[PDB]
RNA sequence: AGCUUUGCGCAGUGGCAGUAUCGUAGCCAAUGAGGUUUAUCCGAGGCGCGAUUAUUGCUAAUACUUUUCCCAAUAC
């Protein structure tokens, strides 16, 4: 259904961020300043200083290929 | 036919700051640089290296003596 989409990152990266876009179409029309943040969190920061890694990142800064880099 | 807007040059009159200005046959960059806030939101340069009075040129301040003239009878 997507290869290039899969071939670059996995295959439930690629259908995670399908599913909360809503499909090829719907993905095709959004811009990458919003793919990068498709299933960002609210993440209540209980005490700390915003170094929750997901204050504005989604299930492609947790895909295998970003999180295979150093943390900066 | 004046009035007026934008960008670009050439100037003139000012004001402001010298911890910044410039270079980039180096790299990356709207096929996306960078993202601290406004993130299903913003939107351009950034990095490394190099020059330097933290841009670069001038102008001025830090001294007076060479010469070149000389003595003599109305006499054995």
Redesign the pocket.
Known sequence: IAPNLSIIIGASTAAKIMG???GLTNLSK???????????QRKTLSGFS?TSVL????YIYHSDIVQSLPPD
Not at 55 to 58: C, F, V
């Open positions: 909360v876009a809503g959004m811009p990458a300043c919003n793919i990068m943040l498709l299933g960002a915003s204050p504005h990142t989604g």
